[model samples]
Target: SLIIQVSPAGSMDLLSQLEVERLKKTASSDLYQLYRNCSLAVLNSDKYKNFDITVMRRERGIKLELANPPEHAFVDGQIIKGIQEHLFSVLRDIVYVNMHLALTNATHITNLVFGILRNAGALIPGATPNLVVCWGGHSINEVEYQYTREVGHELGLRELNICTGCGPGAMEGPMKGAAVGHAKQRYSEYRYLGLTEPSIIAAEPPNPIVNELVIMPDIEKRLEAFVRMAHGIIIFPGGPGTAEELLYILGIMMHPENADQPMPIVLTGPKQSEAYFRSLDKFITDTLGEAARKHYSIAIDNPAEAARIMSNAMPLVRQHRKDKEDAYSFNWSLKIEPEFQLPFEPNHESMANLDLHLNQRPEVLAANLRRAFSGVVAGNVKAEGIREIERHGPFEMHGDPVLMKKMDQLLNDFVAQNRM
Candidate 1:
């Protein structure tokens, strides 16, 4: 157990007087719980520290008092630099952002995502379109993990940036690998961005190497940030969370409004995971049809080729955004419907109410299927979903018989392979 006073890093050092008062006032309000929990999650990298952190009021800028915190949090009795930055990041996102609004309109929701990212300094006005969003499991095996790093190294060698869920396994692998790739290529202005929300961040804490950490309000906003900021996307082998992301992007891409978009998608893994991708491919085509599969291609085991594909797509993505008179930093041209934008709470009622029948439009079904998997992710990770499961029982899913069969088979395989 240790006690320490943390100072501000980054833009947090320059807080306005009104903002300082607001932070002190909100520390005891509903925002404190979320702010504390996310701070704890970020510090879990330091040997799972049992911490009781709170906002300590000061005359000018505020400070954080962490009692019983991690020994590893300190370097010569001061907080580690990166951990300090992340702690302030938690404070900024949860307390200072003025979140927890009642707005539900589509444009308002999209603006909310952009506002949070913009506050985090994530959306640079004239930066090149080189950010690659990598989606994968936080609990993957060593082999799969190594493959993700290889792909990251390849991406780093080509001067591409990385954005991920900011957790362990595949997410950390690419960042670590990219660190090496960037260092070797003398690429100093690299960005390793991690986008996470409150609930999921607790389950999968942001790894230490995450230089740019932005905590969006929910999974919906986090997903939106990924697609909007990504110049290219690479999908590594993961579980239901990965599935939700795949479906979300595919559903958006399948929309008639985004038909001409040049976002490149690739699913790649080690040679051993080829069978896994095969099962995933079949499930995708079986339910969403061949049109959905056309959005992305699969590369069996080659990391270099995967990175090359993304690097090659950079100009096309840039040119497309330019030609359409859209911002290069954010993909404003992509049309995300209300179905994908609205947050889906996964109670027993909402889980059972999903429209999974094949008679609906393929993109609409894709949205519904994405919600089903989102529920699965919640049950597995989120605290509220866990309690709901304990208070009642497992969520009961209902959908078309044929689609249900395919879903069951794919999920069972995930369990059999220890992916769940």
Candidate 2:
């Protein structure tokens, strides 16, 4: 057995008494399952490229152990400086949310989200509008992966920074490509920010390429953090998780209150994946109407064009920020409904309770649809969701027959494309 002690690298020091209590309470052998799993993921980052969660779990039996842990994360058997910093970040967020934020009855979770981002040092006031949030999947083929990297490269060449979910495949590909682009341009002040939650991070660990790793309390806040901190957003071909992300953004954009919000969103993939996107586009149009499709433009096989479009749109983002007097690092002026902010526990009951009908407002319905995919993602990889499904059964989803058929077809295509 190998043991490593880690410490802080940046400024994630000092914890409130309440926070310490929560962390200590959660560290009880049985209760700390998710926390341990996620921490192990960070330590086992090097092995995850060729191994799955099952293999990792089997190697540890019912307990946790590290085998040939990543050399980079350690300094002569002592865990590296940054990994320790991220470890406490994980501890701090998990404890805070479970003990404080999640229990609050506040109407505006956005404020709480802002507070969490601030606590994590993610909010940089007065910074230029150059942070681009890249959304994609952990499991992707070579062509799609290369396409994502090219897009990141283009963005980096323009001196733009990249933020992602910080896993392998699509997440790592963009950051790797962006590093090359930034190196060529001699850009030293680049930030490859990786945002993840404890539950998801276990399945998708932070890639070695990520310079900054932040562990959000849960998936909902993690998603919100992405949009709140982004100047522009890009989407590459991905699985259900990516669909969930796109729907989240679209649901927000479709809201009447955000009609004038200047968030530039572009969806791109390789030429071969054009048909896949078209299918997704058709599903959105059929389910949410043509107006919903107007919020995003689809760019096929052209990373440079996607980057150029995002670069050109930055001026509009800056102008909007200036006009509203909103801080450059965060979008406080945007309206996000409670439905999108609140956490959705992807259990069988919650999944079954989703009101997936056409009578509701389009944005509300879009939010529900997004939740449906999120549940699917939970069932696919999240340990809690997977265990719940095994103890119970496959989640039952009920919706309008027409919309349900479209969803079925879209999901089928995703599975056929090996996206699930």
Candidate 3:
């Protein structure tokens, strides 16, 4: 199977005639390449934190042919189950987003995201909203990784399931712990779900425990899925990618429309990460103002306590959904500004135009800040972003000098501690 063709998973084996034709045409489509690249990335998972797929090519962009797929990945277009599911899932989600859906309507964002998750078999009929969307670094040290797993074990013992970006480190840690926790507690229906997009998948491939994996059309949709699906969020130590997730939630929660939203957020790490959260705390306060610091609680070195906090917080989340008449499985009431929902292409000009100062509302500033880090994540890892940097030199971002200093300090702190 050194050289194999990519066939989609069995879930897509049965599709409507009209759309099926569209999918078959994906071999030469831009969407096709996105799916192709991401599947291979998830299929093989050892990349640097700053890795980018574009670096693998020169001159033109990706010329992805199955070239040499692993054993059983290409068997006359009937690849093995896992590979087939993921490979075709890339195509499946891509087709739905571009050809069939309406993304312009803010209402459609939630609906669009739900459709993808449901299609992936994650929207189980009888399930309650116990899913914890864990955000953290794919590249992290042994102690941090161990601490994440221990926290997962604690959550699992209490019968809470886990969800993540489906990459390594923090993503794998909770799932790993929860599996054992479920085993010991005899919780029969535990799910380890992973959500990802084509852009970042190459560098952060899906971990092995992800029995449920979904590939959203892009990063925006991916983040939408995370917040909508989460009953609560557990954040761990990370770098640019982690920062992007933080700013995303902060921007959303701080919006006046969602001011009363009951999404519980906890930032936790082992003792070594104590200083890490403090620095992040200072940065958020410095840029977004003191109000931003109240959105979440920080937990240091107490894995059991973190899990207990998350577990205990679930009833309130459930009650909030019920009281608000929102579906427990998906949070539809959370209002996201247009800027946060729109796709961000991290080119030099776009990156340079980010409003990273405090002149606007705190949430608006957080959104712009999110984009700034989003660009850094791309420049450091995503192929096109890396290529842009190589072509035009680094992205020239702008902000208030004071705010800029804090942002720089936060990053400097990250790089110095090897969190990046």
Candidate 4:
């Protein structure tokens, strides 16, 4: 472990003299604090706890060290090439988030959303609609991990490029399986995109298989990025973080404006996890209502069927996207309310104040519940979140009597099963 400088390359490789001077000023400012933290995360991908935050805070950011890379993380004195590339990406995104948000007025939030993705080369002009965004937990048993790989293998056989939150477990499984899937078919140029944010990267760092990584500004932007960039969403069993993602898509689809949008969402797992699906189904139908239930189909122990369920819809999705004059790479036609697009900081006050009841519109309730789980996710990870809870206690949430009960039961069951 030692002190070091992380360099930028390519488009980030050069700066005019004036640009360099401006960067010097910016680097000397508080924003550099944000920049270095992400750099540390990118460079030090091991140490799964909020361990990076601990060291930086201990020094109050005056001095920090890039922890010794795990033995396999190095080959010939320099680190792996992808990690090097990703470190520069962190600097690029960190600066852009600070610069753009503070200076320019957006045409709208959508423009801001697309601009970030555009800079990362995520939304290409003529790409096909084949990026299936996989969502699941970073924690799981060995059998569960293998099943997810099987599903990924199936998705790859059909040449559907995989995007995920870019962490371990199911997120890594699909991309790994799909690699062999593509190779068997003698494929080329498949995109294994991993979307992350500064907050999430520490908790769920990009898996080694993710060749293309984009770090959104925050979790809200991260969630929106996932949905807009996805052709379909496949969820394996997961914890509160996964639940948060599941609800975001369901809420967006329930919007009447998106009623005609052909977004395929498939929930699947090995048959052993049927009870998990049954439990998830009950949670959805019970909390969000029957209408929400119609948005997704379930595939138990059938990776090929699950892959086919989404892959077969590519033609329909392509046509719907064309009919709406939507961009093939990003779903511009899908209507995301400001509620879904705006950032939701999970402070103790905000978490306690959420309207978690069911009398509201299904989509509205879905968003609230989504935020509820979002808060739970933060409190469980991130140094910022852990500090908040330590000082203020667990976030207090209230809602309709039945709704509160359901959320409680889900949390308790998840913990008992060690899914957390």
Best by TM-score: 1
- lDDT string for model 3 (135-173, tens) is 998789999999999999998999987878966788788
The better candidate by lDDT, 2 or 3, is: 2
Give a tens-digit lDDT track for model 2, residues 72-117. 6666767655565555566656555666533444344777778777
lDDT of 1: 0.86
Q: Which pairs of residues collide in model 2?
A: none
Report clash pairs, candidate 3: 2-68, 8-88, 9-84, 52-381, 54-383
Report the candidate with higher TM-score, 1 versus 4. Answer: 1
TM-score winner between candidates 1 and 2: 1
- Angstrom error of the Cα, residue 32, model 1: value is 0.5
Kindly report which residue stretches of model 2 are placed more than 4 angstroms away from their true locations once superposed. Answer: 14-22, 25-34, 46-85, 95-108
Best model number under lDDT: 1
Worst window of 10 by summed lDDT in candidate 3: 49-58
Candidate 4 per-residue lDDT, tens place, 205-228, comes to: 776567778888788888888888
lDDT of 2 at 6: 40
Tell me the whole-model lDDT of each prediction, alpha carbons only.
0.86, 0.78, 0.76, 0.77
Per candidate, the number of residue pairs that clash is 0, 0, 5, 0
